[PDB]
Amino acid sequence: LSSEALMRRAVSLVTDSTSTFLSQTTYALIEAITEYTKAVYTLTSLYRQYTSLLGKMNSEEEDEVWQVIIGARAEMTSKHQEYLKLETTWMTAVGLSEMAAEAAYQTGADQASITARNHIQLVKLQVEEVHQLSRKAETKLAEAQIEELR
Amino acid sequence: LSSEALMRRAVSLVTDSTSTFLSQTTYALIEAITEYTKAVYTLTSLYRQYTSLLGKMNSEEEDEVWQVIIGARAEMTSKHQEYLKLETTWMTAVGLSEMAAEAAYQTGADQASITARNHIQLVKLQVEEVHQLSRKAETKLAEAQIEELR
């Protein structure tokens, strides 16, 4: 409508495009964290299966375990690096959501504001719990690798 | 626990807001179809006056209608400056709707997938139907031209 309303509509177009991009990036981040956690869980499950089949160690399965340990060191460094980069990308996505919320609050949407606040608190609890679980998973993996000496 | 109740009251607020929004958009769609028909008829009526009534009146009215053509062309460009953003906002709406359909198919929410598919279909039908009224008027103008020429 007016000049301020025209600016609102232009920033609405821009923020809708960047929110399409932000939804894509956030869904990709959620799927990547899911793959993170499920790969860690699958590696731990395979290790638990190998420990449950103890006593009948053979050359084939022990060589497989050696490969798993080498790939587990590589996975440790890769998991640390990708945890750093995923945290950085989540911070970038949070900043994008922050500017989108600034545009929406300058627009005047209040139902969207309260829905976003409820979503923010719920996902804050959820991501805190899931990230604590993940970090504990790699902490336990590192501790087990360290105590493998004895 | 289950976040079903959280989703329930979130979408209850969302559905109240979108019911108010649906009534408001019914009113705004009445307004928009009225404005779009008025703009298309203004364009075609100025074209009709440009083509049909030259030379019948005297010289002073000839100069008057020429200055009217110039000024009305400038004012029509100024007024039509708003319609260029409509195409781009429909482009981003179609892209976002296709993304929503794909994301809901991926997540598996049948109700959300149906909602997004019908969302893209309905916005397509609405914009294509206002544009269809416009292009029906344009086709009538072209038919009147080809019948008037021959």
Of A10, A23, A122, which is closest to B6 when you measure between CB atoms?
A122
Neighbours of A22 (CB within 10 A): 19
Contact of A104 with A113, CB cutoff 8 Å: yes
| B28: Cβ contacts below 8 Å, ≥ 6 apart | none
Asked whether the beta carbons of residue A20 and residue B96 sit closer than 8 angstroms, the reply is yes
In the chain, the amino acid numbered B88 is: T
Neighbours of B130 (CB within 10 A): 18
Per DSSP, A110 falls in state: S
Neighbours of A19 (CB within 10 A): 19
> What is the count of residue pairs from A and B with beta carbons less than 8 Å apart?
36
In angstroms, rounded to a whole number, what is the distance separating the alpha carbons of residues A7 and A107?
Answer: 10
Nearest to B33, CA basis, from B142, B127, B123, B140: B127
Pull the structure tokens for residue B25: 């958009």
Nearest CA-CA distance, residue A62 and chain B, Å? 39
Q: What resolution in angstroms, rounded to 1 decimal?
A: 3.0
In angstroms, rounded to a whole number, what is the distance separating the alpha carbons of residues B78 and B60?
Answer: 27
Q: Please, what is the end-to-end C-alpha distance for chain A in angstroms? A: 74
Pull the structure tokens for residue A11: 């920033």
In angstroms, rounded to a whole number, what is the distance separating the alpha carbons of residues B135 and B79?
Answer: 19
| B96: Cβ contacts below 8 Å, ≥ 6 apart | A16, A19, A20
Domains of chain B and CATH, by start? 1-150 (1.20.58.70)
Contact of B99 with A24, CB cutoff 8 Å: yes
Residue B144: Cβ-neighbour burial (10 angstroms; 0-12, 13-18, 19+): middle
In angstroms, rounded to a whole number, what is the distance separating the alpha carbons of residues A150 and A143?
Answer: 12
In angstroms, rounded to a whole number, what is the distance separating the alpha carbons of residues A27 and A61?
Answer: 37
Pull the structure tokens for residue A62: 């022990």
Chain B stretch 30-89, residues whose beta carbon is closer than 8 A to a beta carbon of chain A: 85, 88-89
In angstroms, rounded to a whole number, what is the distance separating the alpha carbons of residues A91 and A31?
Answer: 16
Contact of A76 with A138, CB cutoff 8 Å: yes
Does B12 contact A at CB distance below 8 Å? no
Contact of B6 with A118, CB cutoff 8 Å: yes
